[PDB]
Amino acid sequence: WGKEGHEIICKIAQTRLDETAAKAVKELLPESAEGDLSSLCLWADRVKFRYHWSSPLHYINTPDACSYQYNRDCKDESGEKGRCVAGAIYNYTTQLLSYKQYNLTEALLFVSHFMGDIHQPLHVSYASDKGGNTIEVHWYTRKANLHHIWDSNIIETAEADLYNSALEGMVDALKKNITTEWADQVKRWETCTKKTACPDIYASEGIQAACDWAYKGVTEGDTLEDEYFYSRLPIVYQRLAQGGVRLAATLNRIFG
Ligand SMILES: *[C@@H]1O[C@H](CO)[C@@H](O[C@@H]2O[C@H](CO)[C@@H](O[C@@H]3O[C@H](CO)[C@@H](O)[C@H](O)[C@@H]3O)[C@H](O)[C@H]2NC(C)=O)[C@H](O)[C@H]1NC(C)=O
Ligand SMILES: *[C@@H]1O[C@H](CO)[C@@H](O[C@@H]2O[C@H](CO)[C@@H](O)[C@H](O)[C@H]2NC(C)=O)[C@H](O)[C@H]1NC(C)=O
Ligand SMILES: *[C@@H]1O[C@H](CO)[C@@H](O[C@@H]2O[C@H](CO)[C@@H](O)[C@H](O)[C@H]2NC(C)=O)[C@H](O)[C@H]1NC(C)=O
Ligand SMILES: Nc1ncnc2[nH]cnc12
Ligand SMILES: [Zn+2]
Ligand SMILES: [Zn+2]
Ligand SMILES: [Zn+2]
């Protein structure tokens, strides 16, 4: 996701931390963050070139089908197994279990960003179109690629048009629904029988959404506007809420 999506996910997650995880996050954040995890939830995107080995860790490339399997797909262009967002999440969550050898401030920031990215449908999608990056369309009157529409345009258009430029408005509405509309599902989103995290569950859901909602109905050159926007917005809400709820559930398991 772009900045807004990661901020939303981290804002939701930080208010769902239990006391031991809230304590560990406050201790691991640098002073400049002023205690706010969401002020650094895009840090990982800012080291894609300084730490070039980290670039493939933001997504998963799959064959053209609605299927995801860790052993088949979690590898980078060189074929090195484990170098994809699911493998990164296992890596950095395992490093945080050592909290109170690695920089754990970086592990916390990578886990926060990657838990977000693994919930963007087009970050678990086709290698053949680079996760929709090569599908060129128009978002209303402007040129955009489909990947960027999902990382940024849908959220930005909702923030301006539906929330009158208050992104805290979108956060607040998601938090209200996590409490009043989605409570039973939220309990399932939080459940993980693994030691730490369950990224393969989230990636499987994500390629299914890429097929059914993101790629669906889209052809190079189409103009995506109100019909696509209103029909896809609920899936974006769902994924941002799942990302926030799961990031908190994971950090609570790790630090507890
Ligand atoms: C798990 O997390 C660790 C910590 O961020 C990652 O370690 C980093 O791994 C990369 C290689 O993938 C290392 O870079 C390479 O280093 C060697 C020289 O040491 C150099 O020959 C290569 O050109 C490249 O720069 C990097 O140094 C290393 N960083 C640390 C602090 O250990 C690891 O990649 C992650 N694995 C995942 C997410 O699957
Ligand atoms: C752990 O990693 C973080 C992020 O890479 C380091 O913090 C950065 O430190 C440099 C100076 O070395 C500053 O210019 C950056 O502003 C810092 N980034 C952030 C996000 O705070 C941190 O120093 C590392 N801790 C170590 C080496 O023990
Ligand atoms: C929170 O949930 C409410 C209720 O489901 C959502 O509002 C509904 O949105 C649908 C479109 O998905 C409309 O067709 C209904 O008319 C709305 N219902 C009501 C009572 O207004 C709302 O969009 C959700 N907000 C978030 C951020 O998830
Ligand atoms: N190749 C790729 N596949 C999916 N998402 C991406 N984001 C940046 N590059 C990507
Ligand atoms: Zn992102
Ligand atoms: Zn992206
Ligand atoms: Zn990213």
Short mmCIF file of C-alpha atoms and ligand atoms in Angstrom, two decimals:
data_model
loop_
_atom_site.label_atom_id
_atom_site.label_comp_id
_atom_site.label_asym_id
_atom_site.label_seq_id
_atom_site.Cartn_x
_atom_site.Cartn_y
_atom_site.Cartn_z
CA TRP A 1 0.00 0.00 0.00
CA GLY A 2 0.89 3.64 -0.19
CA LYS A 3 1.20 5.92 2.83
CA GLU A 4 -2.44 6.15 3.74
CA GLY A 5 -3.03 2.40 3.75
CA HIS A 6 -0.04 1.69 5.99
CA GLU A 7 -0.97 4.55 8.35
CA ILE A 8 -4.51 3.14 8.69
CA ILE A 9 -3.26 -0.35 9.37
CA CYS A 10 -0.73 0.81 11.94
CA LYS A 11 -3.18 3.17 13.67
CA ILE A 12 -5.69 0.36 14.07
CA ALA A 13 -2.95 -2.04 15.27
CA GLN A 14 -1.46 0.27 17.82
CA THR A 15 -4.76 0.72 19.66
CA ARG A 16 -5.23 -3.04 19.83
CA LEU A 17 -1.92 -3.84 21.58
CA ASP A 18 -1.98 -5.38 25.00
CA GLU A 19 0.18 -3.83 27.71
CA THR A 20 3.33 -5.98 27.11
CA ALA A 21 3.32 -5.32 23.37
CA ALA A 22 2.49 -1.58 23.90
CA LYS A 23 5.52 -1.40 26.17
CA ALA A 24 7.86 -3.19 23.73
CA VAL A 25 6.72 -1.00 20.81
CA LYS A 26 7.29 2.18 22.80
CA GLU A 27 10.79 0.93 23.72
CA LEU A 28 11.69 -0.11 20.18
CA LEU A 29 10.50 3.05 18.38
CA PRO A 30 13.10 5.78 17.90
CA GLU A 31 12.59 9.05 19.79
CA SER A 32 11.71 10.85 16.56
CA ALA A 33 8.55 8.75 16.12
CA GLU A 34 7.08 10.34 19.25
CA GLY A 35 5.63 7.00 20.29
CA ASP A 36 3.53 6.58 17.12
CA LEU A 37 4.12 3.35 15.15
CA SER A 38 2.21 4.79 12.21
CA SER A 39 4.73 7.55 11.77
CA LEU A 40 7.22 4.86 10.53
CA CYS A 41 4.98 2.35 8.79
CA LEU A 42 6.41 3.42 5.38
CA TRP A 43 10.04 3.13 6.57
CA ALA A 44 10.39 -0.18 4.78
CA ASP A 45 9.54 1.41 1.45
CA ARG A 46 12.36 3.92 2.06
CA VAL A 47 15.11 1.29 2.25
CA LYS A 48 14.16 -0.65 -0.92
CA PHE A 49 17.39 0.69 -2.58
CA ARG A 50 19.65 1.15 0.41
CA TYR A 51 18.81 -2.49 1.34
CA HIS A 52 18.26 -3.84 -2.14
CA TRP A 53 17.90 -7.41 -0.91
CA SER A 54 14.70 -6.16 0.76
CA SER A 55 12.81 -5.15 -2.42
CA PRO A 56 11.31 -8.59 -3.22
CA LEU A 57 10.20 -8.92 0.41
CA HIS A 58 7.22 -6.61 -0.22
CA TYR A 59 5.20 -8.95 -2.41
CA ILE A 60 4.58 -12.49 -3.76
CA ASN A 61 4.56 -13.31 -7.47
CA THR A 62 2.28 -16.21 -8.51
CA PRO A 63 1.42 -17.99 -11.79
CA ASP A 64 -1.73 -16.76 -13.57
CA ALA A 65 -4.28 -18.64 -11.37
CA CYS A 66 -6.05 -17.92 -8.02
CA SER A 67 -3.69 -20.07 -6.07
CA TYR A 68 -0.89 -19.43 -3.53
CA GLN A 69 1.50 -22.06 -2.10
CA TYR A 70 4.55 -21.09 -0.01
CA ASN A 71 6.89 -23.72 -1.37
CA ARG A 72 5.97 -22.93 -4.98
CA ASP A 73 5.73 -19.11 -4.84
CA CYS A 74 7.76 -17.79 -1.98
CA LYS A 75 11.03 -17.14 -3.79
CA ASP A 76 12.55 -14.16 -5.53
CA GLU A 77 13.48 -13.75 -9.20
CA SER A 78 16.72 -15.70 -8.55
CA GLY A 79 14.75 -18.60 -7.16
CA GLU A 80 15.96 -18.16 -3.58
CA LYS A 81 13.26 -19.72 -1.36
CA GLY A 82 11.74 -17.56 1.35
CA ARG A 83 12.35 -14.22 -0.32
CA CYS A 84 8.80 -12.86 -0.52
CA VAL A 85 6.49 -11.06 1.93
CA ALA A 86 5.33 -14.29 3.66
CA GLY A 87 8.92 -15.35 4.25
CA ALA A 88 9.81 -11.85 5.48
CA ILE A 89 6.98 -11.96 7.97
CA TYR A 90 8.20 -15.31 9.37
CA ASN A 91 11.75 -13.94 9.47
CA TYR A 92 11.08 -10.71 11.32
CA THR A 93 8.44 -12.11 13.67
CA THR A 94 10.96 -14.81 14.72
CA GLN A 95 13.58 -12.11 15.36
CA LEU A 96 11.20 -10.20 17.64
CA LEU A 97 10.66 -13.27 19.83
CA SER A 98 14.20 -12.50 21.07
CA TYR A 99 13.19 -9.12 22.47
CA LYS A 100 14.42 -8.58 26.06
CA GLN A 101 21.90 -10.86 15.93
CA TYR A 102 19.49 -8.26 14.70
CA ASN A 103 18.37 -4.70 14.89
CA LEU A 104 14.92 -5.20 16.51
CA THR A 105 13.76 -1.65 15.69
CA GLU A 106 14.14 -2.63 12.02
CA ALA A 107 12.38 -5.99 12.67
CA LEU A 108 9.40 -4.14 14.24
CA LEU A 109 9.23 -1.70 11.31
CA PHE A 110 9.58 -4.48 8.70
CA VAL A 111 6.92 -6.64 10.46
CA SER A 112 4.51 -3.64 10.63
CA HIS A 113 4.97 -2.72 6.97
CA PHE A 114 4.96 -6.33 5.62
CA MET A 115 1.85 -7.33 7.57
CA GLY A 116 0.27 -4.42 5.76
CA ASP A 117 1.61 -5.31 2.30
CA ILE A 118 0.60 -8.98 2.51
CA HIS A 119 -3.02 -7.72 2.81
CA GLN A 120 -2.92 -5.61 -0.42
CA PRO A 121 -4.47 -8.02 -3.00
CA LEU A 122 -2.10 -7.00 -5.75
CA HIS A 123 0.89 -7.68 -3.57
CA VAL A 124 0.02 -11.43 -3.92
CA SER A 125 -0.67 -11.61 -7.60
CA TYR A 126 0.64 -12.35 -11.06
CA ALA A 127 4.28 -12.31 -11.97
CA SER A 128 3.18 -11.82 -15.62
CA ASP A 129 1.87 -8.27 -15.06
CA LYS A 130 4.16 -7.45 -12.08
CA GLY A 131 1.22 -7.42 -9.72
CA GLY A 132 -0.88 -5.19 -11.97
CA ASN A 133 1.94 -2.67 -12.40
CA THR A 134 1.92 -3.21 -16.19
CA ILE A 135 -1.89 -2.88 -16.55
CA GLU A 136 -2.34 0.73 -17.65
CA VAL A 137 -5.78 2.25 -17.26
CA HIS A 138 -7.30 5.56 -16.15
CA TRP A 139 -8.52 6.25 -12.61
CA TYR A 140 -11.32 8.73 -13.43
CA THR A 141 -9.62 11.19 -15.81
CA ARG A 142 -6.00 10.43 -15.02
CA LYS A 143 -3.57 7.77 -16.20
CA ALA A 144 -2.74 5.13 -13.54
CA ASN A 145 -1.70 1.48 -13.37
CA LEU A 146 -3.91 -1.03 -11.59
CA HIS A 147 -1.33 -1.74 -8.87
CA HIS A 148 -1.21 1.96 -7.92
CA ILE A 149 -5.01 2.12 -7.91
CA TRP A 150 -5.02 -0.49 -5.13
CA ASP A 151 -2.00 0.84 -3.20
CA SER A 152 -3.26 4.44 -3.35
CA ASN A 153 -6.01 5.81 -5.61
CA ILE A 154 -9.00 4.03 -4.09
CA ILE A 155 -8.03 5.05 -0.57
CA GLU A 156 -7.13 8.60 -1.58
CA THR A 157 -10.38 9.10 -3.48
CA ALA A 158 -12.37 7.75 -0.52
CA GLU A 159 -10.44 10.02 1.91
CA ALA A 160 -11.24 13.11 -0.15
CA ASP A 161 -14.73 12.35 -1.39
CA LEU A 162 -16.32 10.24 1.30
CA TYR A 163 -14.40 11.42 4.36
CA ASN A 164 -13.98 15.16 3.49
CA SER A 165 -10.21 14.90 3.83
CA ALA A 166 -10.24 13.35 7.35
CA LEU A 167 -8.29 10.04 7.15
CA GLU A 168 -8.94 9.73 10.90
CA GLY A 169 -12.53 9.51 9.73
CA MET A 170 -11.77 6.27 7.81
CA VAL A 171 -9.81 4.92 10.78
CA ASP A 172 -12.65 5.69 13.11
CA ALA A 173 -15.26 4.06 10.85
CA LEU A 174 -13.13 0.90 10.46
CA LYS A 175 -12.62 0.70 14.25
CA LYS A 176 -16.36 1.09 14.77
CA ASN A 177 -17.14 -1.70 12.39
CA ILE A 178 -14.45 -3.99 13.88
CA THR A 179 -16.50 -3.60 17.11
CA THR A 180 -20.14 -3.54 15.88
CA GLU A 181 -20.39 -5.21 12.50
CA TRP A 182 -17.46 -7.65 12.19
CA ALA A 183 -16.94 -8.93 15.69
CA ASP A 184 -17.31 -12.63 14.94
CA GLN A 185 -15.06 -12.46 11.85
CA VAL A 186 -12.51 -10.39 13.79
CA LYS A 187 -12.09 -13.29 16.18
CA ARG A 188 -11.23 -15.56 13.28
CA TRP A 189 -8.88 -12.97 11.73
CA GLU A 190 -6.93 -12.99 15.05
CA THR A 191 -6.59 -16.72 15.38
CA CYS A 192 -3.32 -18.30 14.49
CA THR A 193 -2.25 -21.81 15.59
CA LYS A 194 1.36 -21.10 14.54
CA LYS A 195 4.02 -20.01 16.96
CA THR A 196 4.01 -16.50 15.62
CA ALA A 197 2.27 -15.51 12.50
CA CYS A 198 0.12 -17.11 9.79
CA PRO A 199 1.06 -15.18 6.58
CA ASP A 200 0.17 -17.99 4.20
CA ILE A 201 -3.50 -17.63 5.30
CA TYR A 202 -3.42 -13.93 4.45
CA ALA A 203 -1.66 -14.43 1.12
CA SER A 204 -4.17 -17.10 0.05
CA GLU A 205 -7.04 -14.71 0.74
CA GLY A 206 -5.17 -11.98 -1.12
CA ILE A 207 -4.61 -13.77 -4.47
CA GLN A 208 -8.30 -14.84 -4.30
CA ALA A 209 -9.20 -11.13 -3.93
CA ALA A 210 -6.81 -10.14 -6.73
CA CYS A 211 -8.70 -12.55 -9.02
CA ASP A 212 -12.21 -11.76 -7.92
CA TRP A 213 -12.00 -8.04 -7.27
CA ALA A 214 -8.82 -6.37 -8.46
CA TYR A 215 -8.14 -7.91 -11.87
CA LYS A 216 -11.80 -8.75 -12.41
CA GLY A 217 -13.37 -6.86 -15.22
CA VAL A 218 -10.25 -4.79 -15.94
CA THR A 219 -8.61 -4.50 -19.35
CA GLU A 220 -5.69 -2.32 -20.47
CA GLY A 221 -7.09 1.10 -21.42
CA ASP A 222 -10.36 0.92 -19.45
CA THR A 223 -11.48 3.88 -17.36
CA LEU A 224 -12.15 2.84 -13.77
CA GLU A 225 -14.39 5.27 -11.97
CA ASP A 226 -17.47 5.28 -9.74
CA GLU A 227 -18.73 1.75 -10.49
CA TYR A 228 -15.33 0.12 -9.81
CA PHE A 229 -14.68 2.51 -6.88
CA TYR A 230 -17.87 1.80 -4.94
CA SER A 231 -17.81 -1.92 -5.64
CA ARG A 232 -14.18 -2.36 -4.56
CA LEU A 233 -14.13 -0.03 -1.62
CA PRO A 234 -15.64 -2.61 0.77
CA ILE A 235 -12.80 -5.07 -0.06
CA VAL A 236 -10.22 -2.37 0.60
CA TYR A 237 -11.91 -1.68 3.98
CA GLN A 238 -11.84 -5.38 4.75
CA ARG A 239 -8.17 -5.79 3.97
CA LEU A 240 -7.07 -2.70 5.91
CA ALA A 241 -9.11 -3.88 8.94
CA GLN A 242 -7.71 -7.42 8.66
CA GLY A 243 -4.16 -5.99 8.35
CA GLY A 244 -4.62 -3.84 11.49
CA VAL A 245 -6.24 -6.60 13.54
CA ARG A 246 -3.63 -9.15 12.49
CA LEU A 247 -0.63 -6.91 13.03
CA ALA A 248 -1.83 -6.29 16.63
CA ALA A 249 -2.64 -9.97 17.20
CA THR A 250 0.82 -10.93 15.99
CA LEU A 251 2.67 -8.34 18.05
CA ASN A 252 0.66 -9.34 21.12
CA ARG A 253 1.66 -13.01 20.58
CA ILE A 254 5.28 -12.10 19.97
CA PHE A 255 5.79 -9.87 23.00
CA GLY A 256 3.62 -11.84 25.37
C1 LIG B 1 15.67 -11.65 7.45
O1 LIG B 1 16.12 -10.49 8.10
C2 LIG B 1 17.53 -10.22 7.96
C3 LIG B 1 17.78 -8.91 8.69
O2 LIG B 1 17.21 -7.76 8.05
C4 LIG B 1 17.93 -10.14 6.48
O3 LIG B 1 19.38 -10.14 6.46
C5 LIG B 1 19.95 -9.44 5.42
O4 LIG B 1 20.06 -10.38 4.34
C6 LIG B 1 20.67 -9.80 3.16
C7 LIG B 1 20.70 -10.91 2.14
O5 LIG B 1 19.40 -11.34 1.81
C8 LIG B 1 22.11 -9.33 3.49
O6 LIG B 1 22.62 -8.60 2.36
C9 LIG B 1 23.64 -9.22 1.62
O7 LIG B 1 24.81 -9.22 2.45
C10 LIG B 1 26.01 -9.78 1.83
C11 LIG B 1 27.21 -9.32 2.69
O8 LIG B 1 27.04 -9.65 4.05
C12 LIG B 1 26.29 -9.19 0.44
O9 LIG B 1 27.18 -10.07 -0.23
C13 LIG B 1 25.03 -9.02 -0.43
O10 LIG B 1 25.34 -8.19 -1.55
C14 LIG B 1 23.88 -8.39 0.36
O11 LIG B 1 24.16 -7.03 0.72
C15 LIG B 1 22.08 -8.38 4.67
O12 LIG B 1 23.41 -8.03 5.04
C16 LIG B 1 21.38 -8.99 5.87
N1 LIG B 1 21.31 -7.99 6.91
C17 LIG B 1 21.51 -8.31 8.20
C18 LIG B 1 21.43 -7.18 9.23
O13 LIG B 1 21.69 -9.47 8.57
C19 LIG B 1 17.38 -11.31 5.68
O14 LIG B 1 17.60 -11.09 4.28
C20 LIG B 1 15.84 -11.50 5.93
N2 LIG B 1 15.35 -12.70 5.27
C21 LIG B 1 14.08 -12.80 4.82
C22 LIG B 1 13.21 -11.66 5.11
O15 LIG B 1 13.59 -13.80 4.18
C1 LIG B 2 18.52 0.06 13.99
O1 LIG B 2 17.97 0.47 12.74
C2 LIG B 2 17.47 1.80 12.72
C3 LIG B 2 16.91 2.03 11.34
O2 LIG B 2 17.80 1.54 10.34
C4 LIG B 2 18.62 2.78 13.00
O3 LIG B 2 18.11 4.11 12.99
C5 LIG B 2 18.56 4.98 12.02
O4 LIG B 2 19.85 5.49 12.42
C6 LIG B 2 20.40 6.46 11.50
C7 LIG B 2 21.78 6.81 12.03
O5 LIG B 2 22.59 5.64 12.09
C8 LIG B 2 19.51 7.68 11.39
O6 LIG B 2 20.03 8.59 10.39
C9 LIG B 2 18.08 7.24 11.01
O7 LIG B 2 17.22 8.35 11.12
C10 LIG B 2 17.56 6.12 11.93
N1 LIG B 2 16.28 5.60 11.42
C11 LIG B 2 15.25 5.43 12.25
C12 LIG B 2 14.01 4.74 11.70
O8 LIG B 2 15.27 5.81 13.42
C13 LIG B 2 19.18 2.45 14.38
O9 LIG B 2 20.26 3.33 14.72
C14 LIG B 2 19.68 1.01 14.38
N2 LIG B 2 20.15 0.70 15.72
C15 LIG B 2 21.35 0.13 15.90
C16 LIG B 2 22.40 0.22 14.80
O10 LIG B 2 21.64 -0.46 16.94
C1 LIG B 3 -19.09 0.00 8.21
O1 LIG B 3 -20.19 -0.89 8.07
C2 LIG B 3 -21.34 -0.19 7.58
C3 LIG B 3 -22.51 -1.17 7.68
O2 LIG B 3 -22.24 -2.34 6.93
C4 LIG B 3 -21.06 0.24 6.14
O3 LIG B 3 -22.19 0.98 5.60
C5 LIG B 3 -22.93 0.34 4.62
O4 LIG B 3 -22.18 0.40 3.39
C6 LIG B 3 -22.83 -0.34 2.36
C7 LIG B 3 -21.82 -0.52 1.23
O5 LIG B 3 -20.88 -1.57 1.55
C8 LIG B 3 -24.13 0.40 1.97
O6 LIG B 3 -24.77 -0.30 0.89
C9 LIG B 3 -25.07 0.50 3.21
O7 LIG B 3 -26.14 1.41 2.93
C10 LIG B 3 -24.29 1.06 4.46
N1 LIG B 3 -25.08 0.87 5.66
C11 LIG B 3 -25.39 1.87 6.48
C12 LIG B 3 -26.11 1.49 7.76
O8 LIG B 3 -25.13 3.04 6.24
C13 LIG B 3 -19.85 1.14 6.12
O9 LIG B 3 -19.51 1.42 4.76
C14 LIG B 3 -18.66 0.47 6.81
N2 LIG B 3 -17.57 1.41 6.90
C15 LIG B 3 -16.32 0.92 6.88
C16 LIG B 3 -15.15 1.93 6.89
O10 LIG B 3 -16.09 -0.29 6.82
N1 LIG B 4 6.69 -7.17 -9.11
C1 LIG B 4 5.77 -6.78 -8.24
N2 LIG B 4 4.71 -7.59 -7.99
C2 LIG B 4 3.78 -7.17 -7.08
N3 LIG B 4 3.74 -6.05 -6.38
C3 LIG B 4 4.82 -5.28 -6.66
N4 LIG B 4 5.12 -4.04 -6.14
C4 LIG B 4 6.32 -3.66 -6.73
N5 LIG B 4 6.79 -4.55 -7.58
C5 LIG B 4 5.84 -5.57 -7.56
ZN ZN B 5 2.60 -0.92 1.02
ZN ZN B 6 2.40 -1.75 -3.85
ZN ZN B 7 5.93 -2.08 0.69
#
